[PDB]
């Protein structure tokens, strides 16, 4: 998890939202085993991602290109693959980087100095 | 019949004067039901949930108003009685 990415909790919340079915092992996900622990889906409603009855294989989570990707284990081709971006707000990062150089300051009077 | 306590349990008796609003199939052998997860209400058909699609309706209110209420709860901004604010 890079500092430029969004918060881990918001990412797992988005992962919860993308699946309409509740996640049984949702609370077991931490900042070190998200790529390893497969997702346990209690199918009461159809899978929000392929509309099938159930999957013989569990769904697993992966991290690539600064973004979070969801796929089905076993035969991933039988189930669709979705991608959710994980990077943060770019303009805020740019503003922080610019301010880190101490190039603009306050006058104490009401103006700015450059 | 629905209330804040039985809305998750009572099935809905729909009158299929027209085909189903969501699946377009004529009638349902099994009535629909509501369920609540992730701050949203999910409507689904009982029995086989694949013959009838699944919809979501959000339940959370306006986010920015809640944030403003939380900020005002801390008493960090006040009125000066002269026409401006202090922070």
UniProtKB/TrEMBL annotation, chain B:
Domain of life of the source: Viruses
Function: Multifunctional protein required for genome uncoating and replication. Major viral uncoating protein that is required for the release of the viral genome from incoming viral cores containing the viral DNA genome. Possesses an ATPase activity that is required for hexamerization and uncoating.
Subunit structure: Homomultimer; hexamer. Interacts with OPG148.
Family membership noted in the UniProt record: Belongs to the orthopoxvirus OPG117 family.
Protein name per UniProt: Uncoating factor OPG117
Annotated organism of origin: Monkeypox virus (MPXV)
Lineage: Viruses, Varidnaviria, Bamfordvirae, Nucleocytoviricota, Pokkesviricetes
């Amino acid at each position: 998890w890079e500092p430029g990415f969004i918060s881990f909790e918001d990412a797992i919340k988005r992962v919860s939202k993308i699946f309409i079915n509740s996640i049984i092992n949702f609370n077991d996900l931490d900042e070190n085993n998200f790529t390893t622990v497969p997702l346990v889906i209690d199918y009461v409603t159809p899978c929000a991602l392929c509309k099938k009855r159930s999957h013989k294989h569990p769904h697993q989570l992966s991290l690539e290109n600064g973004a979070i990707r969801i796929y089905k284990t076993g035969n991933p081709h039988s189930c669709k693959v979705k991608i959710v971006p994980l990077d943060g707000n770019k303009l805020f990062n740019i503003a922080q980087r610019i301010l880190d150089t101490n190039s603009v300051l306050l006058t104490e009077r009401g103006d700015h100095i450059v």
